Amino acid sequence: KSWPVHNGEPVFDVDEIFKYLLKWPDVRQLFELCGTNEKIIDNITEEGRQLMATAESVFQKVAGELENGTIVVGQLELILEHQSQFLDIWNLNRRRDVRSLLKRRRDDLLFLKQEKRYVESLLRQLGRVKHLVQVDFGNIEIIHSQDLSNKKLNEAVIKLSYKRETHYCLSPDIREMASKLDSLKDSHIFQDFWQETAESLNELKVSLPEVLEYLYNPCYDNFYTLYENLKSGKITFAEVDAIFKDFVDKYDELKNDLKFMCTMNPQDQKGWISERVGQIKEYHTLHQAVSSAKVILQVRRALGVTGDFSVLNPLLNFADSFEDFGNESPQFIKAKQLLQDISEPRQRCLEELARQTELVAWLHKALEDINELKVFVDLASISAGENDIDVDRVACFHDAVQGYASLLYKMDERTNFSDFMNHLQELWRALDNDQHLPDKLKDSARNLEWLKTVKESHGSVELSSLSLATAINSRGVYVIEAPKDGQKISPDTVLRLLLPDPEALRTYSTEELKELLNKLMLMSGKKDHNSNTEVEKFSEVFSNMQRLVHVFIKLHCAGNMLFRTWTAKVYCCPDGGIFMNFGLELLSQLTEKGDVIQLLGALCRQMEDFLDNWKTVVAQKRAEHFYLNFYTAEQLVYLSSELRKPRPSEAALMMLSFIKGKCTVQDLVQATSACESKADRYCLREVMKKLPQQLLSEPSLMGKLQVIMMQSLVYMSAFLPHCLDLDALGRCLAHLATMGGTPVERPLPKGLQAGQPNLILCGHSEVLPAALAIYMQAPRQPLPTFDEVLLCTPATTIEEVELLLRRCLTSGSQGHKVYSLLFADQLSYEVGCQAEEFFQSLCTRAHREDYQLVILCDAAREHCYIPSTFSQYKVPLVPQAPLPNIQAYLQSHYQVPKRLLSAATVFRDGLCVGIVTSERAGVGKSLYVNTLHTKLKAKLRDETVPLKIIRLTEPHLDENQVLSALLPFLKEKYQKMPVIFHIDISTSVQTGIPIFLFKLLILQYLMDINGKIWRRSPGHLYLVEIPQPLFKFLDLFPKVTCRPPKEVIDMEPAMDPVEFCSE
Amino acid sequence: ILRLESAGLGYRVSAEETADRLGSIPLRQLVYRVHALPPSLIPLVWDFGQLNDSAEKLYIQQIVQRLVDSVSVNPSETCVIADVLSASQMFMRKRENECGFVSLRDVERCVKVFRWFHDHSDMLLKELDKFLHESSDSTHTFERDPVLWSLVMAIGVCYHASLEEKASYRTAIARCFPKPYNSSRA
Amino acid sequence: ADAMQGQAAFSELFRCLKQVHLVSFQCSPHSTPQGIISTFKQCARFQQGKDLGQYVSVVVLDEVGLAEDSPKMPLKTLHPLLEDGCIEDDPAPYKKVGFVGISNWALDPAKMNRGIFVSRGSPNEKELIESAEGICSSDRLVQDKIRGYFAPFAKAYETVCQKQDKEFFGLRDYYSLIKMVFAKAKASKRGLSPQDITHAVLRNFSGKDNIQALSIFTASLPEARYKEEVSTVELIKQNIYPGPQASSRGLDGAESRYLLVLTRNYVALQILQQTFFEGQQPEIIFGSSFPQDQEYTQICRNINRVKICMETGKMVVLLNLQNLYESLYDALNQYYVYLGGQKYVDLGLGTHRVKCRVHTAFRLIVIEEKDVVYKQFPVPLINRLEKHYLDMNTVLQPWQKSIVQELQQWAHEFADVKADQFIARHKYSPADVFIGYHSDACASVVLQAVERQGCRDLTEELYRKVSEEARSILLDCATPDAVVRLSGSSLGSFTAKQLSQEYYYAQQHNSFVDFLQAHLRMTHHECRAVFTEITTFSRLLTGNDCDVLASELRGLASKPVVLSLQQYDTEYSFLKDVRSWLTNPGKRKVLVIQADFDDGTRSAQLVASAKYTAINEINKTQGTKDFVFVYFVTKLSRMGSGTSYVGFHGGLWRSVHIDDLRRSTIMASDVTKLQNVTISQL
Ligand SMILES: Nc1ncnc2c1ncn2[C@@H]1O[C@H](COP(=O)(O)OP(=O)(O)OP(=O)(O)O)[C@@H](O)[C@H]1O
Ligand SMILES: Nc1ncnc2c1ncn2[C@@H]1O[C@H](COP(=O)(O)OP(=O)(O)O)[C@@H](O)[C@H]1O
Ligand SMILES: [Mg+2]
């Protein structure tokens, strides 16, 4: 149980076992107890004895290695770490001289490691100046690099004395120079000497024998001469301030460096370091005093006051002159006494005050006294900024003047040295509590522009970042409107914040409110609870208002047709109240005062619960009627709003053409007249009568809102008498569907079952044709549409695929249909997961057990969620019909019949959809379109035919652009006279061509999930260009091609009357 | 391209799975990351002058002569500024590659930097003298021509900084300079 | 930015130049053209109303090399926004604006070629030594007493940067290594120890698994070989806690990067709360999961909290850098603009960057999972932080590993009971018996026990006590019926009797109120905030139990309040509830936070957020004389919901299982007596 388990008895080596024997203090006692008496070794076990034998053999091997030189150095150092245990075990195992052997071994290991340190130091010295001189280090450059796993025996410990190691030193001379570079490795002056001797060479490959002479020897001779000069004390101050310049007021390390100096030559060190280091310190302090006195004379000249010092003139006279001696002379000590122990710092303080004569002059010009500062800081606070730097500007100014008014305001034009020294002493005492005060003075001085524009500041138009929060808290009205203009419905354009005062008004948007929010979570803190309470209240009211906006758009896009005209004016003021309004003539205003935060949160609670119950009831209504399952929530809202009007918009009728086909307003009113009996009117009247009496039953707005939302949920037509509720919507859609005769019947192909979903893997190039092979097994029938065919794309809304699954699995439909989910693999992980959960739930609840659901996928993309979870329901056929069959099917189904008055008459026997292409461009594609246009103009005189031309030029070809370009073209019915569109496409559109072409041409639809629907009309011509994957897919549609003249002059015309007739 | 990929950390996305492709090559590593000219434009493109560098001297000659306002700057040193900038452009061309194919474009900007340095050329030289007097020998304490020093700064901004092989540029550019900075070391 | 202020510049050269105002828009792979367009609009707006010859704004795209291959192609309007500065308008002045496009990856040349690329290359050994010399220019003799290490270090770093395909290491690591050797050498004033170099090299070069970086750097410096062991816990403690002399001289320029802890199963917080947090308890800046909270408001408050912690000097433990990195990248850079001796980092939300103060002692700890950092972290963020690994085994020394294995065996035998009282062979996992057992729990409980002792000296005397205390921990959250059933268990007979005796005499589980009475009397271990979480099978408190608890507690409790997780849709509802609970006078308060895992709500992932928010409030509202007591109560079901319950969490949390919440006068409060007596003898 003490073996070194390493995930279960692996050893395959010997070093780990040796470590285990050496370190464990119980192997020692176990071995000693076993060796004392052999009556214990005879009875242990069969495996314990074998492991003991293995450990014994390992220790025997290492012990045998010890006597000779093959013992590895690492295990040797382990023994040098566990000397005691190894000695005891060796003494025990002697029974089956050592102290002298161990002592000699430790001595020779010390020699080895000291040589190792010496060669390391040599490499350090010769690589420190590597950029100046390059050295080839014999063989040691690679011998020192290898780790110490090499064998010991290479250390050649021989007698007849000298011990040669694997580091092949050229001579004992280089060994000694490396040793002395190790002893002097830690001197700054030695570093400077080495650098200055190395720069005396210059890109020269210089070897060690001439490194010793060219580099080391001059350095050492100069070092010796300097050491002798320092011992004598005959040095001059030019060399001193040249070399010791890097020893300013750091004298303990200087003393230690001089000790390292004196250890180089082995002599005594008693009475030389102290006085010489004191002389260096005195010289440094004299230079510092010279600099400080120069700065004082500068401020006396420049600040403005003449003063009278007349004491440092001899010092200045000495400063401009040069003397060459290294001794101390006594006549200046009494003069220097006054600044014997001033400081090393804080001359930065006086020199920063001195170099800024503009600040002091301006402060004396403007302030003139110390009592005005307290008013002045307050006056500057309002003029300052809002962030941390701007707020702390006034604080650093105030602290700077508080710490500098002693030597700034308490001075006389005639001062005596004693009182000036006392004032300076008090100044240092005051500065000691803020050692960054000179920085504060400089930072305030550099803000002289802001600080001169503070007294003369006029009315500044900048309210605050926090007083503005005060304004929002006092009178801010959060106004939700859901504007009805041409703008969108994003959470940015539905919420506004009106701030009154005069009678001017300012309207913050959510973007500007967010900007201010970022501004005032980062603003300074006054350590005052009022600021942070007020900002917290603003942030929370805005957060609950943002979440109300979130829920409101969630409910609008989920489709409520009752909150379309909802509006709310929250008064954030304490006990201001929240004021709701519905866009109706029968619903009163709902207002309640009190705390805004908690009651707003409760209101959002009821709003979200109403949203949940609304999703539940809309799901039930769709599961019942099955024709609210052709439009998602936004299209349902549009239809409901536009159905009650006497004339529905042409967009609504074109959308409804997907349920009925050739929809008309007369049929729409005929259906909507039979979708409600007088019992419904009586019920709504009863609700209207009972409603106010139950409203008056609750004091708070919570209960009244709850009851009003429950009544809108159950009985909605009473609330909004200009938009159909989901139930009336379903009745209208179902009656229109039943009125539409000849239901379509599409049978599933062979090998695909009409009661279980059919997953097919075909490959990206065959998904579109194979799906077609599913749909032409019932010829002479109209093509499918966005219903029953979902050309799925990356990031498709879960609601659309849920809608497809719903129309697949609801019983009341009047016709069997095949529902193909194409390219199901590019759906997102989450969209696919929710679609799968939705399919499971919807087949759990109820459906018709005859649905023909097919799921076509990319054969190379089985790794995603939907196909991986769909492996069991796979049909291993991959249906496919011959390509000419697809061509003939699409061509004869694109044929616009006669007596239709279409543009397609100009085409080849009326295909109404065509692709003009060429392998190389610049050939006549657009010219062919224009010649078809003029050929159509030749017929149908009084043409006035428009030619819309959408330029699709973007990467990741997008549907909404083409839909928006199409939208204002055929919602009017006056251009139902034959129209020639012209879709034009660029050569940077590689990633959207096939899905878009199949959607527009085959599916005959283009839909905005939150917008109207375009249906390709059977009778209006289309001409989509295409540049030249797509090569095969292009062939399905009826395609007419044009080739350059050199390619059309051998098989064939390729000419046009218009270009030739022009001059 | 190897230097670009070794610009510290490599490209965040590797060239194997990158999306900015023209054909099989990334548009990332092109000197011109210009998208493909669609057909009917390529059969109509045509090369302009390749800037054979014989007229480049006169182009930079004009560019400085206008954009410096040399009414009182120097009458002769427009020639030296013209020729040093043209020699710099010659070197930038004379590498079998150029950092941005920057002919006549770094020139209109380097003369602007030179004009900026010369309009300011009454204080920076002063602080330069103080800096090299407080910590350097008298060797770097010579009178600096406001027209030459500012030129050195313009060339060190627009050309010298954007190079990893600046030594060759310096030795090829100092041969076109007057006495004070006739050496690349200067 | 700090230097070339118009008239507030630091030197006469800079005063004569323009006035800089920068707006920083960090680029990310998921960037938008509208973001850079809005940043340009903001800088142009700042430019408007000023002098075009004296004031300039500058857009700064800090990571423009990340936004080159987004599907939306964000870096497209950058090329025009530098020549005319606006779109769909007549070109005009005040629209042109300065720009600095910093990047950590190579750029696309052409559309950015109007500017001049400073394509700074990987420095050679010459520039590495030169940068080392420049970094050590601050002092001089301690500069040259570490000069010898300059040549090898760089070389070693080179080999590291050569030996790995992924750029887990960069020049930040080398620079900060030089800085740490600086700081320790100038503090020592005597030289440099092998422990010093080994600590610096390991602390800076760490995190990655397939690198023996210490061995590589000791190959170039064989003299700097360390034979003693080095652990990660001390490395963390000396990253966070600095030295008394450090950061006490004129200005502070030597400091470590903001720390990262790499862990799996999100366990770092446990040990970090248990052993490291001493004296002052940090604030956890995390992604609150209260339902339908707004992410933008949450991160805004998070950044406000971290900024307050900078201004005060209190450590922050972030749990989120996928959304708090665009707002904290410049603060992680750890470069300050001094103003009166005070450090001001850049803090920004979106496009609004301002200089916020930072205290002398403010440490930032990121906590992240190994997989997500190794495949989703941007890479410069790795170099920006000081990677470390303390997951479960760095702090679990091998004898504690033996303890966790022994405890798992003893738990499996505690659960392994065969009894013939009832005719039923129902096998019990330790999940069923110990409520909240999830096969990683024994390591957690042994961690808790050793932290409860804290002596951590192996002199044959502490191992027994840690074993007993961990056993007490595992028993303290066990269902009472199995405690009675212990008789037929593999643990024998005497173990059952002693365990039940401790379970009813030393441990008080008869009543919640009795638990309070037994706890509040005794003095704690110098701890000024203590909280305990409770698991129950009985019904949660209704509202009439608080009154009876207060009546029985006229001198020990302080009129408690009870909150339910079902009613709390926001952080702030919880905030105001705990604030009203803390603002009232009186000491030894009591709060109960209720959450029922057996219901139709999603109130199961809100427990962590609720606990974190409560701890944050306790640490930001407590004075120095009031004591606090929080009792989170969760009710589980005996029908199998006591097995799915992830159990003993760490820190200032001690899971106890109380089967009966309120009281029961009918039954005696000792089931062992009912075991002794039969129905007839009753
Ligand atoms: N058969 C033709 N006879 C005379 N001119 C022709 C003929 N075909 C093309 N052209 C000329 O080609 C010119 C440009 O070609 P065109 O407009 O057809 O390009 P395209 O096919 O749309 O090109 P791209 O694919 O680049 O958009 C036109 O000015 C037109 O006059
Ligand atoms: N005929 C010419 N004479 C002199 N200079 C010219 C002439 N044509 C062009 N240039 C120079 O070309 C430069 C254009 O700079 P650059 O940006 O490189 O080219 P472009 O503006 O075409 O991108 C101008 O500075 C201008 O001095
Ligand atoms: Mg075309």
CA distances from A651 to A642, A967, A1013, C652 (A): 9, 9, 7, 64
Q: Which residue has the tokens 């608080």?
A: C546
| Virtual torsion, Cα A415, A421, A424, A430, nearest 10 deg | -130
Q: Could you tell me the sign of the dihedral formed by the alpha carbons of A434, A439, A441, A443, in that order? A: negative
The two three-digit tokens of residue C584, written as one number? 């009232």
C49: which 2 tokens?
């109303």
Query: Residue type for A587, please?
Result: L
| DSSP single-letter state for residue A1 | -
Of B35, B36, B40, the CB nearest to A922: B40
The three-class DSSP label of residue A696 is coil
Amino acid of residue A355: R
Query: Crossing angle for the helix pair A15-23 and A83-93, nearest 10 degrees?
Result: 90
Alpha carbon distance A912, A1002 (integer Å): 12
Token digits for C536?
């129950």
**CA A835 – CA A825 distance, rounded (Å):** 12
Q: Cα(C218)–Cα(C197) distance, rounded to whole angstroms?
A: 9
SS3 readout for A181-199: HHHCCCCHHHHHHHHHHHH
Query: CB of B106 within 8 A of CB of B85?
Result: no
How far, in Å, CA of A319 to CA of A292, rounded?
12
CB atoms within 10 A of CB A415: 15
3-state DSSP assignment of residue A1060: helix
Those residues whose C-beta lies under 8 Å from the C-beta of residue A906, and which sit 6 or more positions away, are A932, A933, A935, A936, A939, A980, A1021
Which element (helix H / strand E) includes C352? strand C352-358
CA dihedral angle for residue C468, residue C474, residue C479, residue C483, rounded to 10 degrees: -30
DSSP secondary structure code for residue C281 in this structure = P
| Cβ distance of C109 and B33 shorter than 8 Å | yes
d(Cα A600, Cα A576) in Å, to the nearest integer?
12
Q: Is some CB atom of chain C closer than 8 A to the CB atom of A503?
A: no
User: How many residues are given for chain C?
Assistant: 682
Give residue for tokens 């590593």.
Answer: B29
CB atoms within 10 A of CB A131: 14
Which amino acid belongs to residue A865?
Answer: Y
Count helices and strands in chain B by DSSP H and E runs: 7, 0
- Tell whether A446 lies on the interface with C, counting CB pairs under 8 A: yes
Distances (CA, A) of A682 to A677, A688, A722, A730, C512: 9, 10, 17, 20, 59
Pairing of strands A567-571, A477-480: antiparallel
Main-chain phi, psi angles of A133, to 5 degrees: -125, 135
Number of neighbours of residue C462 by Cβ within 10 angstroms: 15
Cα gap C117→C120, rounded to integer Å:
9
Ligand 2 site, residue B59, Cβ cutoff 6 A: yes
The amino acid present at C82, given as its one-letter code, is L
In sign, the C-alpha dihedral spanning A637, A643, A645, A647 is positive
Deposited resolution, Å? 3.8
User: Is A511 in contact with A456 (CB distance < 8 Å)?
Assistant: no
Rounded Cα distance between A990 and A953, Å, is 10
SS3 C502: helix
Q: Give distance in angstroms: CA of C560 to centre of ligand 3.
A: 78
Cα of first residue to Cα of last residue in chain A, in angstroms, is 106
| Chains in contact with C via at least 3 Cβ–Cβ pairs below 8 Å | A, B
Convert A892-922 into a string of H (helix), E (strand) and C (coil): HHHCCCCCCCCCHHHCCCCCCCEEEEECCCC
Q: Is the dihedral of CA C438, C441, C442, C443 positive or negative?
A: positive
User: Hey, are the CB atoms on C116 and B8 less than 8 Å from each other?
Assistant: no
Contact A811, A768 (CB under 8 A): no
Helices A73-81, A15-23: axis angle to 10 degrees equals: 10
User: How far does Cα B183 stand from its chain's mean position?
Assistant: 18
Residues β-bridged to residue C476? none
Sign of the four-CA dihedral C652, C658, C660, C663: negative
**CA distances (Å), A830 to each of A796, A798, A827, A866, A869, in order?**
11, 9, 8, 10, 13
How far is the C-alpha of C236 from the C-alpha of C568, rounded, in Å?
37
Three-class secondary structure of residue C605 per DSSP = coil
The token pair that represents A221 in the structure block: 């001779």
* H/E element, C23: strand C19-24
Contact between A596 and A589 under an 8 Å Cβ cutoff? The reply is: no
Closest Cα to residue C472, out of C514, C427, C505, C513? C505
Check CB contact of B3 with chain C, cutoff 8 Å: yes
- The reply to whether residue B3 touches residue C29, judged by beta carbons under 8 angstroms, is no
In 3D space, the residue among A294, A291, A262, A292 whose CA is nearest the CA of residue A277 turns out to be: A262
d(CA C381, CA A347): 42
Q: Which amino acid is at C600?
A: G
Question: What burial letters (b/e) apply to A857-889, b meaning 16+ CB within 10 Å?
Answer: bbbebbebbbbeebeeebbeeebbbeeeebeeb
Strand C55-60 relative to strand C343-349, pairing: unpaired
| Amino acid at position B103, single letter | S
Residues 64-103 in B contacting C (C-alpha not used; CB under 8 Å): 99-100, 102
- Are A711 and A719 contacting, i.e. CB atoms less than 8 angstroms apart? yes
Burial class from Cβ neighbours inside 10 Å (0-12, 13-18, 19+) for residue A458 reads: exposed
The arrangement of strands across the sheet holding C55-60 comes to: C19-24, C55-60, C98-100
* Whole-number Å distance between alpha carbons of A927 and A982: 12
Residues of chain C contacting B21 with CB distance shorter than 8 Å = none
**β-strands A567-571, A577-581 pairing:** antiparallel
The answer to whether residues B20 and C69 touch, using CB atoms and an 8 Å cutoff, is yes
The number of the ligand nearest the C-alpha atom of B105 reads 2
What is the rounded distance in angstroms from the CA atom of residue B93 to the CA atom of residue C265?
Answer: 58
Phi/psi at B92 (5° precision) = -60, -40
| CA A898 centroid distance within chain | 61
Residue A627 sits at the vertex; the CA angle it makes with A624 and A632, to the nearest 5 degrees, is 105
- In 3D, which of A795, A783, A835, A815 has the Cα closest to residue A1005? A783
Residues in chain B: 186
* Cβ(A574)–Cβ(A470) below 8 Å: no
Contact assessment for residue C635 and residue C538, using Cβ atoms and an 8 Å cutoff: yes
Q: Which helix (H) or strand (E) holds A821?
A: strand A818-822
- What residues in A contact B43, CB-CB < 8 Å? 922
Across the interface, of A922, A987, A988, the residue whose CB is closest to B43 is A922
Q: CA-CA distance, A884 to B171, in Å (whole number)?
A: 73
Q: From the CB of A922, is ligand 1 less than 6 Å away?
A: yes
Q: How far is CA A482 from CA A260, A549, A565, A635, in A?
A: 84, 10, 7, 17
Q: Are A140 and A168 in contact (CB under 8 A)?
A: yes
Task: Find residue A567's DSSP bridge partners.
Answer: A581
Tokens of A592: 């309640």
Could you tell me if residue A308 is left (phi over 0), alpha (psi between -120 and 50 degrees) or otherwise beta? beta
Round to whole Å and give the CA distance between A817 and A745.
6
CA distance to A47, A71, A151, C297, C666, per residue, from A59 (Å): 18, 12, 18, 68, 72
Burial of C615 (0-12, 13-18, 19+ CB in 10 A): buried
Question: What are the chain B neighbours of A988 within 8 Å (beta carbons)?
Answer: 35-36, 38
Residue partners of A192: CB distance under 8 A and separation at least 6: A243
Q: How does strand C655-657 pair with strand C629-635?
A: unpaired
The full DSSP string for A431-445 is HTT-TTHHHHHHHHH
Rounded to the nearest angstrom, the gap between the alpha carbon of residue A746 and the centroid of all alpha carbons in its chain is 50
Residue pair C492/C418 in contact by the 8 Å Cβ criterion = no
Please identify which residue in the block is written with the tokens 């427990």. C607
What distance in Å separates the CA atoms of residue C384 and residue C329, rounded to the nearest whole number?
A: 9
Q: Do A310 and A335 contact (CB within 8 A), yes or no? A: no
Given a contact cutoff of 8 angstroms between Cβ atoms, the answer to whether A227 and A265 are in contact is yes
SS (H, E, C) A87-105: HHHHHHHCCCCCHHHHHHH
With an 8 Å Cβ cutoff, the interface of chain B facing chain A consists of 35-36, 38-40, 43
Cα A679 off chain centre by: 60
Question: What's the Cα-to-Cα distance from A621 to each of A554, A627, A642, B156, rounded to whole Å?
Answer: 19, 9, 20, 76
* Beta bridge pairs of residue A37: none
**Residues B3/C119, Cβ–Cβ less than 8 Å:** yes
What is the rounded distance in angstroms from the CA atom of residue C226 to the CA atom of residue C204? 16
Map tokens 């680029």 to a residue: C27
- What approach was used to elucidate this structure? cryo-EM
- Of C185, C191, C197, C195, nearest in space to C245 by CA: C185
- The long-range contacts involving C573-578, CB below 8 angstroms and separated by at least 24 positions, are C573/A598, C573/A601, C574/C290, C574/C610, C574/C613, C574/C614, C575/C613, C575/C617, C578/C613, C578/C614, C578/C617, C578/C618, C578/C621
Nearest to C123 by CA among C169, C170, C63, C65: C170
Q: Which residue has the tokens 């011998």?
A: A143
Q: Are A2 and A24 in contact (CB under 8 A)?
A: yes
Whole-angstrom Cα distance, residue A326 to residue A336?
18
Judging by DSSP bridges, how do beta strands A1013-1015 and C316-318 pair with one another? unpaired
> Best substitution site from B37, B40, B41, B45 to test ligand 1's pocket, by max atoms within 8 Å of Cβ?
B40
Question: Using CA atoms, how far apart are residues C136 and A813, in angstroms rounded to an integer?
Answer: 83
Q: Ligand 1 pocket, B8 CB below 6 A?
A: no
- Report residue C72 CA to chain centroid gap: 34
| Residue C368 and residue C261 in contact, taking contact as beta carbons nearer than 8 Å | yes
Measured CA to CA, the distance from residue A543 to residue A478 in angstroms comes to 11
Contact list in A for residue B40 (CB cut-off 8 A) is 921-922
Q: Is B177 in the pocket of ligand 2 (CB under 6 A)?
A: no
The DSSP element (H or E) to which C181 belongs, if any, is helix C171-188
Residue A791: beta bridge partners? A822
